[PDB]
Amino acid sequence: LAPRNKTRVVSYRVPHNAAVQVYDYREKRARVVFGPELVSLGPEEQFTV
Amino acid sequence: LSLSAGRPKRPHARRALCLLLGPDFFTDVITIETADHARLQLQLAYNWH
Amino acid sequence: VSHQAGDHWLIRGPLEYVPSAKVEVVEERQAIPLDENEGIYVQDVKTGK
Amino acid sequence: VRAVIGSTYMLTQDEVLWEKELPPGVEELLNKGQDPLADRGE
Ligand SMILES: NC(=O)c1ccc[n+]([C@@H]2O[C@H](COP(=O)([O-])OP(=O)(O)OC[C@H]3O[C@@H](n4cnc5c(N)ncnc54)[C@H](O)[C@@H]3O)[C@@H](O)[C@H]2O)c1
């Protein structure tokens, strides 16, 4: 589809009854985000596929 | 790390850089014989960590 | 600051430089922008480290 | 003939680079085999 803007903050909308795992490889801190929250990657974070 | 993989678990079939030490499982096909000399093959799954 | 007949040194910073009669310009350098947890391998050719 | 290891070196007067020849097959093990754990199975 339309190519994404690499310079834009990468974001994802976790659905209801769902969770994601992201690890900040720079600051060395993991977190699990629950619920319908919106998750935005930091400059070094990644998504646990 | 050079590990084993495949349906009959052949050796040197998966080179790896990091070792995964989380709850997983691998499956192998085992051919065995009974005391009545009946040849029968198995399919097992080994939960490991 | 005193320099010998073969001494190399680096001129850097916000400034206007005019080459002297006894000074020959060898190379122009640009800083390498590195994010945190990124880096380069530099060899100190004077000592090799 | 000796080996100088560490800092950068300038061959002084009355010095020259010396060649170390290896037994046949040792060079093959050195260059082909970088990781024996990966050299045996391929
Ligand atoms: N709890 C679970 O049920 C669970 C958990 C993790 C993975 N799995 C999956 O179950 C599947 C079983 O398939 P299979 O065994 O028939 O395929 P396979 O025979 O090709 O799998 C080889 C086995 O080696 C292990 N492995 C692979 N890469 C590794 C690494 N870098 N370090 C350490 N171990 C490694 C895997 O866990 C896998 O079980 C795996 O592919 C795996 O993705 C299940």
Compute φ and ψ for A9, nearest 5 degrees. -60, 125
Residues contacting residue C39 through CB under 8 Å, at least 6 positions apart: none
Q: Which tokens belong to C37?
A: 């947890």
Resolution in A: 3.1
CB pairs under 8 A between B and D: 8
In 10 A of CB A22, how many CB atoms? 19
Nearest CA in chain B to D40: B12
Query: What are the E-state strand segments in B1-49?
Result: 2-5, 10-15, 24-33, 39-48
Q: Do chains B and A touch (3 or more CB pairs under 8 A)?
A: no
- Residue B24 Cα to ligand 1 midpoint, Å, equals 6
